[PDB]
């Protein structure tokens, strides 16, 4: 269901990493498989060539945490008006306090030791259930 349309109509785009993370852009190809592209350092930008109807989303390249693009989940290049590119602003979301705590703990404890931490089993599961591009596509379909 979630896949780029093979439209063949060019669309120039600026990816702008207005986040503190290293950003990994992900193109959803014609069968819906997620295909990763070169990463952007924080505060940096790239003029790239994409196509109308093509699906993109964005992630932290190291932890796979999800980021937003123009205030939302998915980015689809539109028609270019007056020879001017489309701006794709990549930003941090307001993570819950729970999910932010989980990011920090994950970045301090090796996965083998999540089970030696003194917390309810319910949180051990939450830690091992780390962000993943496939899962989010299954969700976003529903």
């Amino acid at each position: 269901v979630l896949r780029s349309v093979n439209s063949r109509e060019p669309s120039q785009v600026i990816f702008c990493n207005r986040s503190p993370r290293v950003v990994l852009p992900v193109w959803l190809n014609f069968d819906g498989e997620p295909q990763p592209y070169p990463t952007l350092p924080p505060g940096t930008g790239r003029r790239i060539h994409s196509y109308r109807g093509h699906l993109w989303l964005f992630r932290d390249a190291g932890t796979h945490d999800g980021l937003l693009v123009n205030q939302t989940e998915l980015f689809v290049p539109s028609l270019n008006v007056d020879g001017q590119p489309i701006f794709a602003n990549i930003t941090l979301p307001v993570y819950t306090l729970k999910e932010r705590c989980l990011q920090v703990v994950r970045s301090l404890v090796k996965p083998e030791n999540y089970r030696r931490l003194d917390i309810v089993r319910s949180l051990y599961e939450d830690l091992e259930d780390h962000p993943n591009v496939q899962k989010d596509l299954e969700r976003l379909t529903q």
Binding site: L108, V109, K110, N113, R116, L117, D118
Partner: protein, 104 residues
């Protein structure tokens, strides 16, 4: 421009915000409405320095880029009982435990 604050006396802490252009006296009217003590029975401090009623919070060093939502600046509070003011006193927060072995 909004500045974000913790106003602190003894074991009391208030979270609120104010304009960079608002006055020390005006901040006391806020405290009055919350803790029920009028401005004349209040002293406010930046660290050890007593603040003048007519000065702005900007003049006194609370700016929109230092006094942030996720990391607000501290303003000290002291009350007067009868003739004389108490000395400024702010109870520290609790101390965290040692980092567990797995987090080292």
């Amino acid at each position: 421009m909004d500045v974000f604050l913790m106003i602190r006396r003894h074991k009391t802490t208030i979270f609120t915000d104010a304009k960079e252009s608002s006055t020390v006296f005006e901040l006391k009217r806020i405290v009055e409405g919350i803790l029920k003590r009028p401005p004349d029975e209040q002293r406010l401090y930046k660290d050890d320095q007593l603040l003048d009623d007519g000065k702005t919070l900007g003049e006194c060093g609370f700016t929109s880029q230092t006094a942030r939502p996720q990391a607000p600046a501290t303003v000290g509070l002291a009350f007067r009982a009868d003739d004389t003011f108490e000395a400024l006193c702010i109870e520290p927060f609790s101390s965290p435990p040692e980092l567990p072995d797995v987090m080292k």
